[PDB]
Amino acid sequence: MFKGIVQGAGIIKKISKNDDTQRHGITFPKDILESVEKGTVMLVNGCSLTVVRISGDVVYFDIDQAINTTTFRELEVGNKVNLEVRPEFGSLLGKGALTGNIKGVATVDNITEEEDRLKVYIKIPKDLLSEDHIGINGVSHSIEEISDDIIFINYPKNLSITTNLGTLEKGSDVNVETLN
Numbered sequence: 001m002f003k004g005i006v007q008g009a010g011i012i013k014k015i016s017k018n019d020d021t022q023r024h025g026i027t028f029p030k031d032i033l034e035s036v037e038k039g040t041v042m043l044v045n046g047c048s049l050t051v052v053r054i055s056g057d058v059v060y061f062d063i064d065q066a067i068n069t070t071t072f073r074e075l076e077v078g079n080k081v082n083l084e085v086r087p088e089f090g091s092l093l094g095k096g097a098l099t100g101n102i103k104g105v106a107t108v109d110n111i112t113e114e115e116d117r118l119k120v121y122i123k124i125p126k127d128l129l130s131e132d133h134i135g136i137n138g139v140s141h142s143i144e145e146i147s148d149d150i151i152f153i154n155y156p157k158n159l160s161i162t163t164n165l166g167t168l169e170k171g172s173d174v175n176v177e178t179l180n
């Protein structure tokens, strides 16, 4: 179990397209890089993945099992991914605890920045509640409202800074974890 609190951003450095599989090499920030090793299972954009290789600051993952239910297949070199390593000495399982099991891909309907808030409206596709949390790209937060097929999450603006939520646009695909 993870908290859905993103600890840093990685930047995709390389992608190997073999694609019912892809290998992503992601540049990690020093503090995260030094806590991981081959075999580390951690969350990348909310998705549980295993470190295959580390060379200097580039941490590699093979996306295979996850390839059909996540955004990785369509990511590009330079893109920013959310990173979270499991709690070191345990945690109290809330609430919005994440498993890293991504239920599927959804799409940003609308984004508005106003009043110290990042308001994010996500359209949930047919084949994929409002008192629950939801994980989006590994960010766990309470749902604000649901209207039709669209879920409204009202994030504090600081999450714009510390996660890739602040790069999202109308039409951006995201990894959704429902809980549960």
Ligand SMILES: Cc1nc2c(=O)[nH]c(=O)nc-2n(C[C@H](O)[C@H](O)[C@H](O)CO)c1C
Residues within 6 Å of the ligand: 041, 047, 048, 049, 050, 051, 061, 062, 063, 064, 065, 066, 067, 069, 070, 100, 101, 102, 103, 104
């Ligand atoms: C531990 C783990 N490692 C990987 C991995 O290295 N590569 C991969 O593609 N999938 C892994 N998985 C499974 C994914 O977390 C799971 O397939 C997705 O969350 C489903 O959307 C898991 C659970």
